Amino acid sequence: DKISHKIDIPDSAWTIGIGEKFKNAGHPNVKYPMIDDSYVQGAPLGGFGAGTIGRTYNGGFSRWHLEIGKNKYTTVYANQFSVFQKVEGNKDGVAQVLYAGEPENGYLSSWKWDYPKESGMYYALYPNSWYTYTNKDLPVQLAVKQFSPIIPYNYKETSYPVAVFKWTAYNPTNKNVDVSIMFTWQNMIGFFGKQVNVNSGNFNKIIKDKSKDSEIVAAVMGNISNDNEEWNGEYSIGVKKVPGVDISYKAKFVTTGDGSDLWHEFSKNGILDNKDDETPTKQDGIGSAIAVNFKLQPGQTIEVPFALSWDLPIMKFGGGDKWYKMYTKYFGKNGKNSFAILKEALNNYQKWEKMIDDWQKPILSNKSKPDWYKTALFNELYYLADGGTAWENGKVGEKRTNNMFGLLACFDYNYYETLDVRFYGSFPLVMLWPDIEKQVMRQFADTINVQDSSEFKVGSNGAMAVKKVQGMIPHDLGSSYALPWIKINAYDWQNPNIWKDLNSKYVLLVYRDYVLTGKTDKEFLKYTWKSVKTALDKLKEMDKDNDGIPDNEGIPDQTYDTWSMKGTSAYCGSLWLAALKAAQEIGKVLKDNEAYIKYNEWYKIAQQNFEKELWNGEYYNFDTESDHKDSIMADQLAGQWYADILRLGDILPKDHVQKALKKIYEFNVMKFENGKMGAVNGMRPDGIVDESDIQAQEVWTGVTYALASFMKYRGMTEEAYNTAYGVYKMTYDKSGKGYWFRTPEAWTKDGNYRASMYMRPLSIWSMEV
Ligand SMILES: [Ca+2]
């Protein structure tokens, strides 16, 4: 490996060998079918709301999130980078696809597949990833840096459906070597969203943009139809000319054939035919190829940028609504703009790299923090792009000031903006994209007084319940299979209109968003104030026994939606206390004296009774009425955790909080698989895991990262990082379960998982407050 010295990969990048087999991988531990796409994954490409493409560590473009809200795992074999090298003096050169695998059938059989093991590495520090190719049959060493311009406090480039592939080639040998790099791409119009004739009308064109000190050559892969539909648009691949490289292309090769139409050209001398051909296809799949060829002398390095764009302007959801994607603000809505997007990236990628470095530098340069923590902190952010992210720029046929946004809980539970989860998972948005965060919270504010009296069947018990009750915050803002933002509460396993955490979490999120953006946005507090008061007032009515605290009803009426709580719970009780204190403070800011007095009065009574009912001398009991009410819950003081972040002070005595956190570390962490796997949710005071429900026996990744942040703020530094380390280890390490770029909600002691690709572990960013 002589190429690593020519590029700048951070030491905290996650690494794996190209073609590496992983032996230890976990699988779903539930009864019904659940997504398991394997450990062959990578950092995604694509902006927020753009649709994303997962290119794996083996080199394949395999995890397709271009249909917004859906996860489709299948390698499109035509989509590759390939290399040709010939040493000066030799008769023949060698050509190789940079993919550690091969197609299942006979398509593209002429290409040289099966990139060999121990010949290259993949590296990732989101939004960047890299591949190095250090192969004993490739005298010139190559590396690529690939990324999309995901930039905090930037809502423009962050939206773009584009990726840059910045190649570096170096000759360490004593002979001249001819080198070509080729990007191939299938015309994927019709890959989704087209019910019949999936390739029909697809056609490819070549664009040559020549103007003083820029030459770009690109393929635009589109359809002859000018229809405005989810399926129609364009893909583009291309390259910018640099001194010492020549560009060649092939506009049309058949992907549903042996591929020798292209490969016979590339494999001979690394130079393509430059054959333009706009003939549309009928049944056959088609693709394009863009290549560069250059000669490297001994000791010479060259850099060359390629790019990929996709202009698929319309997202359709299963309920029938069609929306424009956010990036259409910047490039237009007609779906004929892929070249414009590509060109912007090829002309500005160096600026974007510097913008990414500028935001990553404060953390990366802090030598007090271990590299493993940096690996997790950056790579967990993959989910902001990969979580079915929807970001609208108008309904098709519709103009508004704001652009609605939604992130899925996950793909197995296909619900946008699950509020009980976003309480944990929205930290990166408030910290790094706060205009999105506040928009999402205004979306929730707008739903508070929505009433939908139609009934639905509750999954857990078969009973009928009202869809949406006035004054109750919704569980979610809909499903990609139905109508995001329009039909809320798509979730039906429990009835969220009786949940005891949603209304409090909503208030806490509101105040959080004010505090973490500088305590200046009075207008945001003004917008949300009626909903906050309504939310707390409704929750107060659920106090059955007049102790000033809502009563859990002996069912799973909160985020642990199979783990029953009864009476006063530490979890919902502490959240309530903190929400009351937040509402007091909002009341002061907005000069709503009567609200300040009321919520102050409620807070004092509830605080007194919470402490009396639950404090046992060592920790706070799980609740007051359940069978295992004396279980030690990892999340028992979630309200105090948020109170620390919101600078609301002590809602419970400092000494008792410290005792409880030490107990959690001692039991839920250290007595669960030697503290190497996070914090198990429920442990009995005898040090055996609570078996009353599956959720008690799970580590929740987002709960554990949040608990680490709580420990850290409370000065328990070693405990904090040791607790978080188990989550990092399970997710990224060779000794873990292979969950990189698909961090799940939960795992059990065997390491097997529930619900990969989950929002909650974005809570790691609470460790940076
Ligand atoms: Ca009560």
Integer Cα distance of 265 and 269 in angstroms: 7
Residue 186, beta-bridge partner list: 287
Provide the 10 A C-beta neighbour count for residue 395: 14
3-state secondary structure string, 143-168?
A: EEEEECCCCCCCCCHHHCCEEEEEEE
Spacing, Cα 287 to ligand 1 middle (Å): 65
Asked whether residue 319 falls in the same domain as residue 440, the answer is: no
| Binding-site positions for Ca(2+) | 543, 545, 547, 549, 551
For tokens 């590759």, the residue is 80
Q: Helices 570-589 & 638-645, crossing angle to 10 degrees? A: 30
Integer Cα distance of 730 and 737 in angstroms: 5
Q: What are phi and psi of 196, to 5 degrees?
A: -145, 160
Instruction: Report the b/e string of 294-311 with b at 16+ CB within 10 A.
Output: bbbeeeeebebbbbbbbb
Q: Which two tokens stand for residue 553?
A: 């009803």
Q: Which two tokens stand for residue 63?
A: 């995890």
Spacing, Cα 730 to ligand 1 middle (Å): 39
Q: What are phi and psi of 109, to 5 degrees?
A: -65, -20
Q: Is the dihedral of CA 685, 688, 692, 697 positive or negative?
A: positive
The residue range of the domain holding 648 is 365-769
Asked whether residue 252 falls in the same domain as residue 400, the answer is: no
Whole-angstrom CA distances from 523 to 508, 514, 532, 690 are: 17, 10, 14, 45
The last residue of a domain, from among 364, 385, 408 = 364
CA-nearest of 743, 46, 67, 160 to 409 is 743
Q: What are phi and psi of 654, to 5 degrees?
A: -50, -45
Q: What are phi and psi of 15, to 5 degrees?
A: -130, 150
CA-nearest of 12, 70, 71 to 41 is 71
Spacing, Cα 582 to ligand 1 middle (Å): 20
Integer Cα distance of 118 and 135 in angstroms: 8
Integer Cα distance of 45 and 494 in angstroms: 35
DSSP letter for each residue of 470-537: TTPPPS-S--TTS-TTTS-----SS-GGG-SSHHHHHHHHHHHHHHTTTS--HHHHHHHHHHHHHHHH
Integer Cα distance of 509 and 577 in angstroms: 14
C-alpha angle 680/685/689, rounded to 5°? 35
Spacing, Cα 750 to ligand 1 middle (Å): 38
Asked whether residue 420 falls in the same domain as residue 478, the answer is: yes
With contact defined as beta carbons under 8 Å apart, do 76 and 399 qualify? no
Residue 468, beta-bridge partner list: 452
CA-nearest of 432, 421, 445, 293 to 359 is 432
The last residue of a domain, from among 328, 348, 364 = 364
Residue 323, beta-bridge partner list: 315, 395
Q: Which two tokens stand for residue 739?
A: 């969950």
Spacing, Cα 369 to ligand 1 middle (Å): 43
Spacing, Cα 558 to ligand 1 middle (Å): 16
Q: What are phi and psi of 573, to 5 degrees?
A: -65, -45
Q: Which two tokens stand for residue 80?
A: 């590759």
Strand pairing category for 753-754 and 746-747: antiparallel
Integer Cα distance of 342 and 306 in angstroms: 9
DSSP letter for each residue of 575-642: HHHHHHHHHHHHHHHTT-HHHHHHHHHHHHHHHHHHHHHHB-SSSB-SBSSSTTTT-EETTTTHHHHH
Asked whether residue 83 falls in the same domain as residue 125, the answer is: yes
Asked whether residue 500 falls in the same domain as residue 644, the answer is: yes
For tokens 């590496």, the residue is 20
Q: Is the dihedral of CA 595, 596, 597, 601 positive or negative?
A: positive
Spacing, Cα 631 to ligand 1 middle (Å): 20
Q: Which two tokens stand for residue 469?
A: 């009750």
Whole-angstrom CA distances from 301 to 244, 252, 318, 524, 575 are: 11, 31, 50, 53, 58
Asked whether residue 429 falls in the same domain as residue 508, the answer is: yes
Spacing, Cα 690 to ligand 1 middle (Å): 25
Asked whether residue 306 falls in the same domain as residue 395, the answer is: no
Q: Which two tokens stand for residue 446?
A: 């707008």
* Cα atoms found within 13 Å of the Cα of residue 350, Cβ hemisphere only: 5
Spacing, Cα 18 to ligand 1 middle (Å): 57
Spacing, Cα 602 to ligand 1 middle (Å): 12
Asked whether residue 135 falls in the same domain as residue 158, the answer is: yes
Q: Which long-range contacts (CB under 8 A, 24 or more apart) does 587-590 make?
A: 589/522, 589/525, 590/522, 590/525, 590/526, 590/529
What is the torsion angle, in degrees rounded to the nearest 10, for the CA atoms of residue 170, residue 175, residue 176 and residue 179? -50
Integer Cα distance of 494 and 692 in angstroms: 18
Q: Which two tokens stand for residue 260?
A: 């020798």
Spacing, Cα 375 to ligand 1 middle (Å): 43
Spacing, Cα 687 to ligand 1 middle (Å): 29
Distant-in-sequence, close-in-space partners of 491: CB < 8 Å, separation ≥ 6: 413, 415, 418, 475, 476
Spacing, Cα 136 to ligand 1 middle (Å): 71
With contact defined as beta carbons under 8 Å apart, do 439 and 457 qualify? no
Spacing, Cα 679 to ligand 1 middle (Å): 28
CA-nearest of 91, 53, 97 to 75 is 53
Spacing, Cα 609 to ligand 1 middle (Å): 9
Spacing, Cα 654 to ligand 1 middle (Å): 24
Q: Give every strand in the sheet of 314-316, ordered side by side.
A: 314-316, 322-325, 390-395, 405-406
DSSP letter for each residue of 379-403: HTTHHHHHTT-EEEEEETT---SS-
What is the torsion angle, in degrees rounded to the nearest 10, for the CA atoms of residue 260, residue 262, residue 268 and residue 269? -170
Asked whether residue 218 falls in the same domain as residue 290, the answer is: yes
Spacing, Cα 216 to ligand 1 middle (Å): 68
Spacing, Cα 626 to ligand 1 middle (Å): 14
* Cα atoms found within 13 Å of the Cα of residue 276, Cβ hemisphere only: 8
Spacing, Cα 573 to ligand 1 middle (Å): 9
What is the torsion angle, in degrees rounded to the nearest 10, for the CA atoms of residue 277, residue 280, residue 286 and residue 292? 30
Spacing, Cα 441 to ligand 1 middle (Å): 28
DSSP letter for each residue of 722-747: HHHHHHHHHHHSTTS---TT---SEE
With contact defined as beta carbons under 8 Å apart, do 255 and 220 qualify? no
CA-nearest of 524, 514, 480, 475 to 497 is 475
Whole-angstrom CA distances from 712 to 288, 372, 645, 769 are: 52, 16, 11, 10
Asked whether residue 89 falls in the same domain as residue 191, the answer is: yes
Spacing, Cα 489 to ligand 1 middle (Å): 26
CA-nearest of 73, 681, 106 to 411 is 73
Asked whether residue 418 falls in the same domain as residue 297, the answer is: no
| Binding-site positions | 543, 545, 547, 549, 551
Q: What is the Rg, in whole angstroms, of the alpha carbon atoms belonging to the chain?
A: 27
Classified as helix, coil or strand, 219 is strand
Spacing, Cα 567 to ligand 1 middle (Å): 6
Residue 142, beta-bridge partner list: 133, 169
Residue 567, beta-bridge partner list: 552
With contact defined as beta carbons under 8 Å apart, do 325 and 314 qualify? yes
The last residue of a domain, from among 349, 364, 379 = 364
Q: Give every strand in the sheet of 14-17, ordered side by side.
A: 14-17, 120-125, 128-133, 141-147, 162-170, 301-311, 234-240, 214-223, 202-211
What's the burial of 149, exposed, middle or buried (CB within 10 Å: 0-12/13-18/19+)?
Answer: buried
Residue 608, beta-bridge partner list: none
Distant-in-sequence, close-in-space partners of 697: CB < 8 Å, separation ≥ 6: 680, 681, 682, 689, 690, 691, 748, 749
Q: How far does CA 600 lie from the centroid of its chain?
A: 39
SS3 content of the chain, % helix, strand, coil (to 5): 30, 25, 45
With contact defined as beta carbons under 8 Å apart, do 405 and 426 qualify? no
- Going by the DSSP 8-state scheme, the letter that residue 255 receives in this structure is S
Spacing, Cα 706 to ligand 1 middle (Å): 27
* Broken C–N links (> 2.5 Å) in the chain, after residues: 398
Peptide bond preceding 305 in cis form (omega within 30 of 0): no
* Number of domain units in the chain: 2
Q: First CA to last CA across the chain, in angstroms?
A: 39
Spacing, Cα 552 to ligand 1 middle (Å): 8
Spacing, Cα 595 to ligand 1 middle (Å): 21
Integer Cα distance of 597 and 442 in angstroms: 26
Q: Helices 502-515 & 570-589, crossing angle to 10 degrees? A: 50
Q: Which long-range contacts (CB under 8 A, 24 or more apart) does 592-601 make?
A: 592/529, 595/533, 599/536
Asked whether residue 332 falls in the same domain as residue 360, the answer is: yes
Residue 120, beta-bridge partner list: 133
Spacing, Cα 606 to ligand 1 middle (Å): 9
Q: Which two tokens stand for residue 738?
A: 């292979």
Spacing, Cα 549 to ligand 1 middle (Å): 4
Integer Cα distance of 589 and 592 in angstroms: 8
Integer Cα distance of 581 and 598 in angstroms: 11
Spacing, Cα 275 to ligand 1 middle (Å): 77
Q: Which two tokens stand for residue 288?
A: 């394009």
With contact defined as beta carbons under 8 Å apart, do 584 and 603 qualify? yes
Q: Which two tokens stand for residue 87?
A: 């040493």
Integer Cα distance of 738 and 743 in angstroms: 9
Q: What are phi and psi of 523, to 5 degrees?
A: -60, -40
Q: Which two tokens stand for residue 616?
A: 């046992």
Q: Which two tokens stand for residue 308?
A: 């990929």
Q: Strands, DSSP E only, in 317-389?
A: 322-325
- Going by the DSSP 8-state scheme, the letter that residue 668 receives in this structure is I
What is the torsion angle, in degrees rounded to the nearest 10, for the CA atoms of residue 592, residue 596, residue 599 and residue 602? -140
